[PDB]
Amino acid sequence: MKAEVSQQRSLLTLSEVDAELARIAHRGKNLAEQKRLDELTAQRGEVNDRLAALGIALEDLDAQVAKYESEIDSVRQREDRDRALVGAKQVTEIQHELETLQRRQASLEEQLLEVMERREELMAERSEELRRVDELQTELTEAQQARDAALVELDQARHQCATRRDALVNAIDDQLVELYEKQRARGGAGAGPLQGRRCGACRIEIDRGEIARITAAADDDVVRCPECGAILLRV
Ligand SMILES: [Zn+2]
Numbered sequence: 001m002k003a004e005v006s007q008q009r010s011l012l013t014l015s016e017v018d019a020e021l022a023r024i025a026h027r028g029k030n031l032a033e034q035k036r037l038d039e040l041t042a043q044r045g046e047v048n049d050r051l052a053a054l055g056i057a058l059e060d061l062d063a064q065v066a067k068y069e070s071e072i073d074s075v076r077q078r079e080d081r082d083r084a085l086v087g088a089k090q091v092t093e094i095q096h097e098l099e100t101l102q103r104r105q106a107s108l109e110e111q112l113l114e115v116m117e118r119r120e121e122l123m124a125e126r127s128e129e130l131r132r133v134d135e136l137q138t139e140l141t142e143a144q145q146a147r148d149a150a151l152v153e154l155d156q157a158r159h160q161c162a163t164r165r166d167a168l169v170n171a172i173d174d175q176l177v178e179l180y181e182k183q184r185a186r187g188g189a190g191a192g193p194l195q196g197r198r199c200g201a202c203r204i205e206i207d208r209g210e211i212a213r214i215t216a217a218a219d220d221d222v223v224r225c226p227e228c229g230a231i232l233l234r235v
Contacts, residue, residue, distance in 0.1 A: 005235055013168060017164050037144055
């Protein structure tokens, strides 16, 4: 197999463009902007979970408040129903009933207050978590805007290299482009520069028996690295 040195020179730029396209794809999956978005999203979810659990607690205290202020309403009604006063003999019995009704309302007042201020404390804690999570939300959208913008730049850069690559392939004979892409299917670079003695693809230190035949090969000949099989470009 043989190929013009000018074709091999463009095959070198073709491998470089392909190597740049690979790192462009790699950085897309390892965006620092997404790592920042991942942390803000986790933190916002942490405040969202506490806000949800705080909501359950205030429901319980609201039910306690409602049940407490449903009992005194019957006590206030029991006093109102018995306020109508007609035999004075049994009135003493209705008078001792009012003394117990007043003690039931007074004891219930101590119970409502303990729940009222405890609910007042939780809603205060709920407000500080709302401002906390709202702060994170504004940061989260900024990180999300920064993440999307970083994806646009990578896609723009990838669109560049894809155009330069298309032009390169049209400038090299299909026979050489075929062997190159057949070598990329093996998992390696497909072609690399001979960096002194070591192949530019698999980066192996080629033995001293192969470099003699490689250096002796004609300039227009194509050479494959023994270890990996990639096209070694001496130019
Ligand atoms: Zn190699």
